[PDB]
C-alpha cells in the first residue's frame, strides 16, 4: 500500500500498474523453473528403473 | 526430492506419484503469487479514482 501515489500523475499511476504484470511473470517463470528441477531427479529415476 | 541416488531405489509406481504430487502444490503457489500481486495493484487503482 503505497503512499507517494496521491500527488502523482495519472500517465505515472498507468505506467506502474503496466509495469507489474512482467515482474509477475518473471516470477512465475522463475518458480516454474525450481519445479523443473524438482521434476528432473524423478523422471531420471524413472529412466533407471 | 533433489537426489537421484534415493529416488532410483525406489519404485516406478511410487516416482509417478511424487511426480504428480508437484503439480497441484505448483499450481497453489503461483496461485499464491498471483494474490500478492492482487495488492500491489490495489493502491495504484484506488488512486486512480482518486483523481
Redesign the interface.
Given at each position: 500500500?503505497?503512499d507517494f501515489?496521491?500527488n502523482?500523475s495519472?500517465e505515472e499511476?498507468?505506467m506502474?500498474?503496466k509495469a507489474?504484470d512482467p515482474?509477475?511473470e518473471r516470477?512465475?517463470e522463475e518458480?516454474?523453473q525450481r519445479?523443473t528441477?524438482?521434476?528432473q531427479?524423478?523422471?531420471?529415476?524413472?529412466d533407471?528403473?
Open positions: 500500500d503505497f501515489l496521491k502523482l495519472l499511476l498507468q506502474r500498474l507489474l515482474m509477475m516470477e512465475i518458480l516454474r519445479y528441477a524438482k521434476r531427479p524423478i523422471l531420471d529415476a524413472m533407471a528403473k
